[PDB]
Amino acid sequence: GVFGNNEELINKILQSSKTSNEPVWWLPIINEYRATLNSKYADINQISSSVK
Amino acid sequence: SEVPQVVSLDPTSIPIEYNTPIHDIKVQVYDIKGGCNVEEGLTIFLVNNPKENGPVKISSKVNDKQVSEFLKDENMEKFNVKLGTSKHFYMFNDNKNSVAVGYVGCGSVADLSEADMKRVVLSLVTMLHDNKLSKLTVVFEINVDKNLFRFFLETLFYEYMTDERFKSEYIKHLGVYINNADTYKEEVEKARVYYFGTYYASQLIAAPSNYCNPVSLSNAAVELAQKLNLEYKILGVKELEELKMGAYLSVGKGSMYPNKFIHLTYKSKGDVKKKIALVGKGITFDSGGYNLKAAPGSMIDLMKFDMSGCAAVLGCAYCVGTLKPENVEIHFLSAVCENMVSKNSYRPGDIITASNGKTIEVGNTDAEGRLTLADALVYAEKLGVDYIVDIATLTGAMLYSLGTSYAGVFGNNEELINKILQSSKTSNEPVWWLPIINEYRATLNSKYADINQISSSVKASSIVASLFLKEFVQNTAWAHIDIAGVSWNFKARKPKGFGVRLLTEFVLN
Amino acid sequence: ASEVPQVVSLDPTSIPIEYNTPIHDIKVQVYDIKGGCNVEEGLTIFLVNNPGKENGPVKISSKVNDKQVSEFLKDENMEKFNVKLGTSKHFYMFNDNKNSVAVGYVGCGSVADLSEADMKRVVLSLVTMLHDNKLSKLTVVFEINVDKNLFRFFLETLFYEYMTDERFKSNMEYIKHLGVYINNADTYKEEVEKARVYYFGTYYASQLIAAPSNYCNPVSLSNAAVELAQKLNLEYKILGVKELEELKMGAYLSVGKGSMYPNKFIHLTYKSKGDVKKKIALVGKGITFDSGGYNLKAAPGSMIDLMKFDMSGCAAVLGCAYCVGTLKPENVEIHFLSAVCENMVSKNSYRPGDIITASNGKTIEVGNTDAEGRLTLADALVYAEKLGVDYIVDIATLTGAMLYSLGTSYAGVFGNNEELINKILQSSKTSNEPVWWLPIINEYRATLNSKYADINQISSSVKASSIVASLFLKEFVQNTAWAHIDIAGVSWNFKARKPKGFGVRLLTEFVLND
Amino acid sequence: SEVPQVVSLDPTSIPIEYNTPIHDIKVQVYDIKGGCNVEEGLTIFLVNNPGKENGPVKISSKVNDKQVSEFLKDENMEKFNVKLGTSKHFYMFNDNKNSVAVGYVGCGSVADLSEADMKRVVLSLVTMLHDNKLSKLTVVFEINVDKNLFRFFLETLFYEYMTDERFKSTDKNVNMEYIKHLGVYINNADTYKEEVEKARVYYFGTYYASQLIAAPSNYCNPVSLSNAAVELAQKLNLEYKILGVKELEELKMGAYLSVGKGSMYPNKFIHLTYKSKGDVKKKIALVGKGITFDSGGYNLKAAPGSMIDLMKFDMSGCAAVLGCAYCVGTLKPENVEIHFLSAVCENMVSKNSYRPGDIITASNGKTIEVGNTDAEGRLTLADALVYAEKLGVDYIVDIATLTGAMLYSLGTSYAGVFGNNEELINKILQSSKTSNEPVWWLPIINEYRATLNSKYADINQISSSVKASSIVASLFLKEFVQNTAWAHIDIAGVSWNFKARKPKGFGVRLLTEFVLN
């Protein structure tokens, strides 16, 4: 799976996937899940409370 | 279509409300130029600050001097725009009439996602449920296209509506202030139709399995068909036997309710230029069969939701039959049954024959959805359609790939897949494209039957299930939407009614 | 009665009940210990302690009327043995007249005040001697201090543990005489026939519980109640399915839907001869087998093979009807209620998620079909309150969690009325069936709020199951003093592999001393 | 005293806040019969309506302002009900032609609010303080409360308002502002006045406890926690000693020492002492469980629902006792002598750990057979109880996160209390009433004692047969108190607020009330 913050770069990876015949598939970074990384005490949680 | 009972107390029909208080709300859209009038009820400004957790600043002119004083920058800067954060105050306006004024923070990103807007609306609804109001006014101080604006209304209507059918005062006016209001007016009634399609689907999903069973669910579809002047046909066990739907029929053998196959048709007045079949998974309760749902986390108490796909298709039938698109013929299908434990149930290991003649080895009686859909797909292709799209709560594995927000779409045809992706964009029901990986196909080779129902090895369940279904469509553009993850809103303890607007947008454009 | 449905013709159609036990043929005499002991017949056993000196030597104080036994009992010989609780020795010998007798002791520890748990150990040690005995008389000599209630407890426990249930089978001989020597004999004598009644009520409850679910089902159990009522001259009524439907007991009927046996609601009545000054309803959980339903008992530790015990509540209420109908208290009207059914897996069973409607009009969202007991109790409670009683007491194997809170010795009691709870606790003391008051914590009530129905059957979150179940039942009692006794932990004796018949004496003492 | 580290980025102390924003709040109490002034930011009426459920709001107070009075007339207010936890905000100009904020919080229909009800009320109030930059709050009491409930209102207002940001860095709340002034209007006010600063003391004890509990195990370890107690003792002028490994060995605390064998931090035994001037009428030992992290040991917490990520909280009892010491050391009660004790260590997995099966010796000569290394608390309490009784005290009270079994008996609201003496138990229950920290009495069932008989050692650590752990645990502890009144408060269920994701600081107020009255 490939995730990213930049469509151009994701596409370079996908194209590199084509020519190297190492199969990769673009998966989304779903921002709705970001709040489950909110920590009561630290800046951020390492893992999610609720999202599997 | 008589609903069998064990005791005389057993329900014989799904209760349905068609006339909801939302349908009595009078909606006006006003242009924001000219300024906002604040005369009654509750006025909410939707506000962002592109900064992070920045202060609230109201831009719009308000044609009331008391309320303008309340909305001046010195006072609003005590509040912030953190997404979903809200405040509202009661006060006297110029006329010494009591009104309430406040805001909903929309954060610090200019273009809200569907998830953000959901959060904004949820905050707005909290205020509506807590205040006896005759009228709500919403002032848009954020940017929003026609589709997101429509989405805001659908969502507001749906979240505002409270389902009370199993229990033993709403606003009468909605005002909207938005820049260039004339362009948005046409979305209002479209929203009302989409709202009810979603709420209707929700009503079937939320209705428990003693209420919503194969007979009462199919009775419900017939009632709907009649109200919309759609052709309808319910196939019963005798018909299904002549049609040799062994995969479908085997799932339902353990039930006290006969299998009921739903087939609604919409045909446009003019020439038909496109034929479509929408196929929904219709398991009214999934106990898992002899592979009982007994493991920790198997969520047996929510398995009334396993008919969500069928619900989605019927909600679409409502929208389509109301908005009357042209040059299309739509078949609405669902192979409805119940997956139970009984002396009559199908067993792990059983070899059954689908209606296209393929023998299947059952490896797990809790992978029932793909067997009923196998026969529904074969049926749909025989209709001679251009597109087959199924929607289904098919694999719990979805929770581990996309989670609870995005449905997955699989398909055998890139054009169809992109049509669904576009429909996902305009309906704001998020879907993501996932691969049908042919290297896994061999794990479905049965030693004895033509094909295995499940893989023993490969844990990529959503993909294997797609690979299974792909065998039952030979020559038609077909896509499959797996909504196992997104159908039920766990936080809110209710259905989303996912899929209706998605499918409808697909049919309409 | 009703016909018991069968699958095959080898299926039993009634519960075998022994009414006339060997226990009833024992003649019981109580003598004052101040006068010395007559040890010329059978097995004589001294109950001895040694205060202060932990595990101290045995020492017999009593004068006996036989020279051979006297020499055996002298200190030089008895100090070979010690008093560690439950430890025993007994010896065969010839008395002065060359007849065969046997003499021993049971240690009662080094603490002067025996608890009921300690007493049970002593009795068990005694029962072990009896289970290998063929002499016709047993004499027990109390060289320890007990009060009236504990003495009655000793007799009841001796009788219950002595009796062995052989109804399902295809060495020793029961004694014909029991002799007791104890201080103040005359004041203890009136406890003997009360103990005999309390014993059989308990034993009768035990026989129903122990009876497996193929023998004991809703039809055979309700039949047994009818037969009991007839032997005791009690008013009875059995409500079948059509009557239950008319009364709208939708929660109760949902639980039974998957069974091959028709639901049977049991209602027996004792009415006193004179003026009636208190009306009580006793309500018993009556699940003749709890498979769990679709939420099947499949997890490790879930104890599915023992789930014939799940009508223990019912058994205890019926055992109480035996005691009450025999002892005939005055000024009281008592109703004995159990909504009996079977919780099974079937095409016809109720499902997780189903919304059902109780007879008081409340709708209930079923979270877990294995939380079946509170559903059947909910309708039974609505039935009881409609009788206009002063007190409703229910008793039930309701929550496994009791095993984690009070364990296998004490039951929990919950209630909406402080006075009724104190009466239960006082009944606990005099019956020596230990109970402990637990709270009904209102803060948890919100967890029962359903999104669609009027109320949830279970909490999703809150793990305090016994409190949550109590909160739920509470919703079906509008304005009557009500208590709930959860015996899921104490009902089955895991070590001895048998029931305790827990509750018969508790409830009987409750109705007798109000 | 020196905290060992693995790498230089390892913390060497617990960050502790003493001067909190709550402490800078000027609090004034006024008598309601003088009438409310409404001049500045946010005035909240606490209002109920007995009998009429969800009944209308009516403001009974005399408000000394025409404009505001006109706003609060019944006619204006009838569209609002008093449903518990409900609030509204009002906005208007007063007589000085100044803008002003006004509102109410519904206190239901029952004239007597429970502590759970009052908590729901404070929570509602607090939401009106968050996300609103106010400099003053005034609360007008139009419900009836006794002096203990009023104090509880303030303690809870203070505690819930305070936001713990010691471990925030790039994510402090940019908009957090605390009021500087709190006004309270109430009937018969000068009776209530002395509750205010007591509330402030009770607030910090709880917050201090809470601060140690929330602090993660890399910050809060036996060295740093015992360092913190010293620091607290110095600030309060309490006598203190910290017993280290070599003195513990001399005291033969083999049970306590075994639990900590596997840790990189040396065991540290905290012993603080408050002594009244004059005649000492009561001597009391308070004993807190101080496992700074409970991994379970070789019986690792690896099962589903084991909550290993929360086990920084296993020092909650010790924190309760240090918080009590703050309150006692601040309020200076007469005629008592208090010892505050905690046998502090970490239960870890190492080549140096104690194993299941080990037989260890307690400081009173009893040999113990360890059946499960994750029942570590009762071992450390065994030695702490033996030490406590050696002080020759009248009452030993211990407080511990001892058994998860509490989640299945009383759940998350009530602590359990066990003991060998009825009078001491009842004093605890009494303190529970006036501290408003709920406790329920639970039995020590002697019949289970036999399941702790060991074949090889004097006694078993755990039961073979009995799933009632809280009771078995208490039976074990009883074995180490020979002739002293002793009670045991099991707070495993209530210590952590799962909904709010933070400590409750449970027990500080309880223990302080116990010591005070």
Ligand SMILES: CC(C)C[C@H](CP(=O)(O)[C@@H](N)c1ccccc1)C(=O)O
């Ligand atoms: C075949 C197994 C892997 C079982 C299921 C498929 P299902 O048909 O029971 C479906 N109803 C489901 C939806 C969401 C959550 C759980 C189950 C699975 O785990 O995907």
Ligand SMILES: CC(C)C[C@H](CP(=O)(O)[C@@H](N)c1ccccc1)C(=O)O
């Ligand atoms: C699995 C849970 C729902 C268990 C209990 C209810 P139960 O009715 O099955 C009862 N029969 C029971 C007794 C003793 C041991 C175990 C089970 C519960 O706490 O709700």
Ligand SMILES: [Zn+2]
């Ligand atoms: Zn399934």
Ligand SMILES: [Zn+2]
């Ligand atoms: Zn399914």
Ligand SMILES: [Zn+2]
């Ligand atoms: Zn059950």
Ligand SMILES: [Zn+2]
């Ligand atoms: Zn049960």
Ligand SMILES: [Zn+2]
């Ligand atoms: Zn532990």
Ligand SMILES: [Zn+2]
């Ligand atoms: Zn611990």
